[PDB]
């Protein structure tokens, strides 16, 4: 009883943690990142200044913490994962197989994110001897990591260090050299606060820094040392230990940094305050992230980069007393803070040994910087513990600094991140076959409007006029040892043109008067000679000496395929003539010719398999809608091996060997039909029969096939109304056909040159072009433009290609009333809002552009939006905006709400403010309802009409239990999403002008988005990371608190859904549900066509659950049913991991499912490409 298939179009782009390590085993460094549930391994490239993704793996769990450690006498780091599985998992990366593999998995508790079950915190000893995993309260477990005789990893049983009432804010491992491992923790005990009945014992925090020493000798853990620290202390940082420095932890709290070790005195330094005019003076700041780095080739030589809540980076250093000579001692003297540079706020920062800084932004794009570092060295004031008071309560004088643009750092890459994804809509603003996905994301001045288009990114190098419309192109080498192919040839309806490498070209050889059907240089290992076949003969050209095969009959040449050692032509009579090559002379024509029942429409010879003399197979398509495979072996030349009938006449054929999903090349026959169909079949390589057919529809134009090379991979380029590239995906290893974001082409060929290699050449409508597909794998192209504030909603003009975004940054004063806000942030101010409207034009130009901004005023913030037509205005659609004044979220504070009304002017490129009408609370939901406006204010459902000076009430009622957050409607039915109590079905009674609620949700749901799929059911998501579909029972549906909605589907994507809609993503027209997630996911739910498909994907999902369990030890069925059990949804993200298995597993699953491996592959690809992309 399954009916939905969940797929991921775009994986999350957030990075809650990035970590550096030699995970490949080489001395090179790599970055491991946690993106929600994806574990991703990235390779920084110091030459190109970019960072490339090595691999990604869906944990099917929640990655809460990651630690790295090295075994003694080894150069390879292992990854410890703290997740929600209740288990500790230790995994390793395998560069030979390009896959993650876990080397340990041990259960320590029950599954989930719970208070008293470790997983929240994880730290590892710097020397790799042990690690500690802990919860917020109160459990801690220490696992000892050792090396066995086999030189493999051994794990002891955990050691308990529990202590009730203890709350942990931070946890880092001490670097004690090779002494007994010690773990530091910021803790506070609530045991006293529960005992004081009135008064407290609260409003105060007794924060302690605690040391947990692990005695390897006695194999136990004890609270060795502890002391009181600043109550505002929130972060700990590891300072180098042993010989590289004195062990210890920087304790970071409100305007406080302290060294604070057990065998050292205290050393306090403040956090400088911004000195800007907009910046509030005497505003204390805290630390949000930080890095420690030890410089090579020198003892000590370590510094810190710490980040303020504004994003400002300060460099911290430690100076220790010197002896009589000029040498350091163990005693510490001072701590020095110096302003470094301002970067976006980050979850993690990473300093690479190659001199780079990787910034994992908490929101917005990620940043890759290169160090310099020029200050000027002492241009920035420096402040030390001399003599700020080690006591946190002791008075002291504030210290200020002036922020400024980048001096020590240079930005080298900005990495596209759709985090945080506030919302998206699916619409087709161009004539293109596929609708686009428009999305609003980012935060602050780094927010953005982004459009996603399904296609492959290609860069055009040259273009030129011809000017006559050419009908074909080729590129060809005169000599088989030239790395750069010499010539470029063009063909017209009555002439032929010849070009070559360089800036300009003309003619020296070849026949330029007549049309040319193909061109190839036959003789590999024989320099001299090209062939130009044309109607009425085959011209063989060799160092200027020309010898031609006559036609010679009244018949002419209608088709031809060429190979290195072989040539095949088809005449108008239907005869096929075959030419092989002797030691000298391409005229070794076969004594006999093969007659065909009808006219030949396509020919494909296939390249010469290396190590062999010739290709053994020839593909012949005819007008009788048949494709045959004829043999070319000497013993049985031109005998028919196989035959297949086709839906339409074959317009093109192409034999080609490609990498397969099972690790070895396979010989395929690509077929292009006159109806726009593309097929890929398997050529048996011996019996020559065709099996395992794949189909796709590309466009109304007849499809044509060519062989190109992209990223050192041989790919098929199919030309239809659009160009499609068929290739084997580099990471996921399946076979993909993705369209090109490029013009329609009528002909294309592989191209080479000194300037570009493995490029391509093509023609269209009086134009020739040279392009290359620089990088594949990324099937979604993204164009973006910045916005002003953090988006909130997105609405589209009902008739014109324009969007309207409402934006609101909380706790920010209006920028006014010299520092770019995207680089340094708007000036913060408590309780003040900054909000605005922006009009976005995404298609009219090459890039999306913001046409106009409408700034709000009066501490007023936009919270909702809709485009509503009003019957009273002859159906004109207006822009409805909801706002609030003096908004405080927790607790919710109502000064006043408002509804602005705007009017579309200049076809939607601008707005005219009509009137603003004040209401009690901010309206969180609008909805067009029967030619009038529906608004949700508080628990109140209200119908407004458009009046001369205000919006006018016409009906109202209380419908939801606490707060309206979404609205939708069909006919007389209104569905109301409550902030906490799920769905509420209301019905409107026209004769009575009453809004009556008649259905409500069974369980609580913290609704975040809704849509109506039909009259009876609603699909939505909630803030705990759930997607669901509820429906009205059939007995209560005829009634036009009392009745309970039925649960029709539920699923845990883990990412928080921010928007959802029903739409069509492909011309095929399968209605799908598209949704977006806060962490960047863009996902689809696809309904199954037949019960057989539902059964196949359910059983496939089961076997994938058995043979590919979640990496971190989760149970996939329990994971996808985190809060309530799974109902109705199959996880296609798991199914699509079938391609990654070893072949024995694939064959086993193929056995249980009673389908071939290639069949399973084809159905997996098919369900995705047919209904979405």
């Amino acid at each position: 009883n399954m009916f939905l298939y969940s797929l991921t179009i775009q994986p999350p782009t957030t990075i809650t943690q990035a970590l550096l390590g030699q995970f490949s085993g080489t001395k090179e460094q790599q970055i491991i990142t946690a993106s929600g549930s994806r574990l991703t391994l990235l390779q920084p490239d110091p030459r190109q200044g970019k960072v490339n993704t090595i691999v990604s793996h869906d944990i099917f769990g929640i990655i809460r913490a990651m630690a790295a450690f090295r075994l003694a006498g080894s150069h390879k780091d292992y990854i410890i994962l703290a997740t929600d599985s209740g288990r500790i998992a230790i995994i390793e990366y395998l560069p030979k197989e390009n896959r993650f593999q876990r080397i340990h998995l041990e259960t320590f508790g029950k599954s989930g994110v719970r208070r008293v079950i470790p997983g929240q915190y994880l730290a590892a000893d710097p020397k790799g001897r042990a690690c500690l995993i802990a919860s917020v309260e109160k459990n801690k477990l220490v696992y000892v990591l050792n090396r066995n005789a086999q030189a493999e990893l051994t794990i002891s049983s955990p050691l308990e260090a529990h202590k009730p009432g203890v709350i942990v804010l931070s946890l880092v491992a001490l670097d004690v050299g090779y002494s007994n491992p010690v773990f530091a923790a910021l803790e506070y005990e609530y045991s006293e606060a529960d005992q004081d009945p009135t008064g407290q014992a609260a409003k105060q925090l007794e924060m302690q820094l605690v040391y947990y020493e692990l005695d390897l000798g006695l194999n136990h853990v004890v609270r060795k040392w502890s002391d009181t620290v600043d109550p505002t202390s929130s972060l700990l940082f590891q300072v180098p230990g042993g010989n590289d420095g004195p062990s210890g932890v920087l304790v970071c709290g409100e305007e406080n940094i302290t060294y604070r070790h057990s065998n050292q005195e205290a050393f306090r330094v403040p956090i400088p305050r911004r000195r800007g005019a907009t910046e509030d003076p005497n505003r204390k700041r805290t630390i949000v992230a930080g890095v420690m780095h030890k410089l090579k080739g020198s003892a000590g030589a370590f510094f810190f980069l710490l980040q303020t809540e504004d994003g400002d980076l300060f460099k911290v250093t430690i100076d220790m007393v010197e002896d009589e000579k000029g040498n350091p001692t163990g005693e510490v003297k001072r701590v020095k803070i110096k302003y470094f540079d301002t970067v976006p706020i980050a979850h993690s920062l990473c300093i690479l040994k190659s001199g780079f800084l990787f910034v994992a932004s908490e929101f917005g794009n990620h940043h890759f910087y290169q160090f310099e570092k020029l200050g000027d060295d002492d241009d920035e004031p420096e402040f030390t513990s001399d003599d700020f008071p080690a006591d946190w309560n002791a008075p002291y004088n504030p210290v200020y600094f002036k922020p400024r643009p980048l001096e020590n750092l240079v930005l080298v890459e900005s990495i596209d991140s759709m985090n945080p994804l506030v919302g998206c809509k699916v619409a087709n603003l161009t004539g293109e076959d596929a609708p686009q996905i428009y999305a609003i994301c980012g935060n602050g001045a780094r927010s953005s409007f982004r459009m996603l288009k399904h296609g492959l990114e290609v860069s055009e190098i040259v273009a030129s006029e011809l000017p006559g419309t050419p009908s074909a192109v080729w590129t060809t080498k005169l000599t088989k040892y030239d790395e750069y192919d010499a010539y470029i040839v063009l063909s017209f309806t009555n002439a032929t043109l010849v070009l070559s490498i360089g800036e300009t070209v003309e003619e020296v050889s070849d026949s330029g008067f007549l049309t040319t059907v193909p061109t190839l240089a036959v003789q590999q290992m024989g320099e001299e000679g090209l062939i130009q076949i044309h109607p009425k003969g085959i011209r063989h050209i060799v160092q200027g000496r020309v010898n031609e095969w006559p036609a010679p009959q009244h018949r002419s040449i209608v088709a031809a395929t060429t190979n290195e050692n072989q040539v095949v032509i088809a005449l108008s009579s239907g005869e096929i003539v075959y030419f092989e090559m002797d030691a000298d002379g391409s005229l070794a024509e076969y004594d006999e010719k093969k007659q065909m029942s009808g006219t030949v429409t396509s020919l494909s010879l296939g390249k010469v398999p290396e190590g062999l003399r010739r290709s053994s197979f020839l593909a012949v398509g005819c007008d009788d809608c048949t494709v045959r495979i004829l043999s070319l072996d000497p013993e049985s030349t031109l005998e028919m091996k196989s035959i297949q009938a086709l839906t339409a006449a074959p317009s093109s054929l192409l034999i080609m060997s490609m990498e397969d999903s099972t690790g070895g090349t396979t010989l395929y026959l690509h077929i292009g039909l006159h109806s726009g169909v593309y097929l890929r079949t398997v050529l048996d390589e011996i019996t020559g029969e065709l099996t395992d057919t794949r189909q796709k529809f590309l466009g109304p134009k007849p499809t044509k096939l060519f062989q190109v090379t992209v990223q050192n991979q041989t790919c098929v380029l199919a030309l239809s109304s659009r160009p499609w590239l068929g290739y084997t995906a580099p990471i996921t290893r399946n076979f993909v056909m993705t369209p090109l974001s490029y013009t329609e082409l009528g002909y294309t060929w592989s191209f080479n040159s000194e300037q570009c290699q493995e490029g391509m050449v093509g023609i269209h409508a009086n134009y020739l072009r040279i392009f290359t597909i620089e990088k594949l794998g990324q099937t979604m192209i993204q164009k973006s433009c910045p916005l002003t504030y953090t988006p909130k909603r997105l609405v589209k003009h009902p008739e014109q290609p324009y969007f309207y975004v409402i934006e609101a940054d909380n706790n920010t004063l209006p920028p006014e009333l010299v520092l770019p806000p995207e680089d340094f942030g708007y000036p913060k101010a408590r309780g003040r809002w900054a909000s605005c409207i922006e009009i976005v034009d995404p298609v009219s130009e090459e890039q999306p552009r913001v046409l106009k901004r409408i700034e709000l005023e009066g501490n007023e913030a936009a919270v909702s939006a809709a485009v509503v037509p009003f019957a009273s205005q002859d159906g004109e659609s207006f822009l409805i905006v909801g706002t609030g004044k003096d908004m405080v979220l927790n607790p919710r504070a109502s000064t006043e709400g408002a509804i602005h009304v705007y009017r579309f002017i200049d076809d939607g490129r601008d707005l005219e403010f009509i009137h603003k009408t004040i209401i009690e609370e901010p309206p969180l939901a609008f909805c067009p309802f029967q030619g009038r406006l529906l608004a949700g204010i508080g628990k109140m459902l209200r119908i407004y009409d458009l009046g001369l000076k205000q919006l006018l009430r016409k009906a109202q009622a209380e419908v939801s239990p606490q707060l309206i957050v979404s609205l939708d409607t069909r006919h007389n039915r209104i569905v109301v999403g409550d902030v906490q109590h799920g769905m509420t079905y209301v019905v409107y009674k026209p004769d009575s002008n009453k809004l009556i609620p008649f259905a409500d949700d069974t369980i609580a749901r913290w609704t975040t988005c809704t849509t109506m799929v039909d009259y009876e059911s609603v699909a939505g998501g909630d803030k705990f990371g759930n997607l669901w579909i509820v429906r009205c029972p059939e007995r209560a549906s005829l009634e036009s608190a009392p009745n309970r909605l039925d649960l029709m589907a539920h699923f845990y994507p883990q990412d928080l859904p921010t928007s959802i809609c029903k739409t069509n993503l492909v011309v095929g027209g399968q209605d799908v549900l598209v949704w977006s997630g806060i962490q960047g996911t863009v996902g689809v739910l696809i309904p199954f066509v037949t019960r057989e498909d539902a059964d196949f994907f359910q059983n496939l999902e089961s076997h994938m659950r058995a043979e590919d369990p979640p990496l971190a030890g989760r149970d996939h069925l329990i994971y996808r049913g985190y809060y309530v059990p799974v109902k109705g949804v199959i996880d296609g993200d798991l199914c699509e991991r079938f391609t990654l298995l070893p072949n024995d597993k694939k064959q086993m699953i193929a056995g249980e499912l009673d389908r071939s491996v290639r069949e399973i592959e084809r159905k997996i690809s098919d369900i995705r490409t047919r209904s979405a992309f």
């Binding site: 609530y190 008064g199 992230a289 706020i345 929101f363 935060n443 705990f1024 990371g1025 990412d1055 962490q1079």
Partner: protein, 55 residues
């Protein structure tokens, strides 16, 4: 019910907010505060989310 019961319910809720990165990012973004700072606020709230206990 008992002050203890409410206190546990709130502490579990704060723990869950800190535990699930998506929810934490959602709330912190709504408040326009850094995620680490919001995390610290939530963990700090665990001391006494409701009123002091009865005598």
């Amino acid at each position: 019910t008992s002050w203890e019961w409410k206190t546990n319910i709130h502490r579990d809720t704060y723990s869950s907010i800190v535990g699930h990165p998506p929810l934490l990012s959602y709330m912190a973004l709504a408040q326009n505060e850094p995620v680490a700072k919001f995390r610290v606020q939530m963990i700090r709230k665990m001391l006494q989310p409701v009123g002091p206990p009865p005598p």
